[PDB]
Design a protein around this ligand. Sequence first.
Ligand SMILES: [K+]
Ligand SMILES: [K+]
Ligand SMILES: [K+]
Ligand SMILES: [K+]
Ligand SMILES: [K+]
Ligand SMILES: [Mg+2]
Ligand SMILES: [Mg+2]
Ligand SMILES: [Mg+2]
Ligand SMILES: [Mg+2]
Ligand SMILES: [Mg+2]
Ligand SMILES: [Mg+2]
Ligand SMILES: [Mg+2]
Length: 88
Amino acid sequence: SLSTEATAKIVSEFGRDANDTGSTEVQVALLTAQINHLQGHFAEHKKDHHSRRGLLRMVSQRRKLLDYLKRKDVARYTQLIERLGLRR
RNA sequence: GCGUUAAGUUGCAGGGUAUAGACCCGAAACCCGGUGAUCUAGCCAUGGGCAGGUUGAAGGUUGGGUAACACUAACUGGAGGA
Ligand SMILES: [K+]
Ligand SMILES: [K+]
Ligand SMILES: [K+]
Ligand SMILES: [K+]
Ligand SMILES: [K+]
Ligand SMILES: [Mg+2]
Ligand SMILES: [Mg+2]
Ligand SMILES: [Mg+2]
Ligand SMILES: [Mg+2]
Ligand SMILES: [Mg+2]
Ligand SMILES: [Mg+2]
Ligand SMILES: [Mg+2]
């Protein structure tokens, strides 16, 4: 759902440089962007169960990445959820 | 068979009959034209009344909760031919 420009913008804002697409912060920010963007799709299409399975995978993938970041560097974790607006 | 050989008629009094309320009193009812919604039934307009004490619906806020909902606890709130 995310376009190329929007994706590239996130990589630059959370990565080390322009092609640090793999860092945990970038991945979590990318997932957060798609999850938030898809809230408008599922408000209109409540019965799109097949797409929602893909969304719930993003949610669980983000939870696992966050639990890993919190276990490695708590400081990086705290900054990340604050910038993104996540409860935990 | 009915008649012919038996005086009627007009007053007055009386007996009966007829039409009339027709010896007197008495229905329940039927019809016609009026008077009544100051009681009461319903409605319409415009005003008033309901001591005191209870119960605690929806909603709201805050926290928990969720990807977001849902959900949940407290506080608040003051529903009802209660
Ligand atoms: K005579
Ligand atoms: K008589
Ligand atoms: K009362
Ligand atoms: K309540
Ligand atoms: K009450
Ligand atoms: Mg993907
Ligand atoms: Mg006479
Ligand atoms: Mg008659
Ligand atoms: Mg009759
Ligand atoms: Mg009258
Ligand atoms: Mg009256
Ligand atoms: Mg009552």
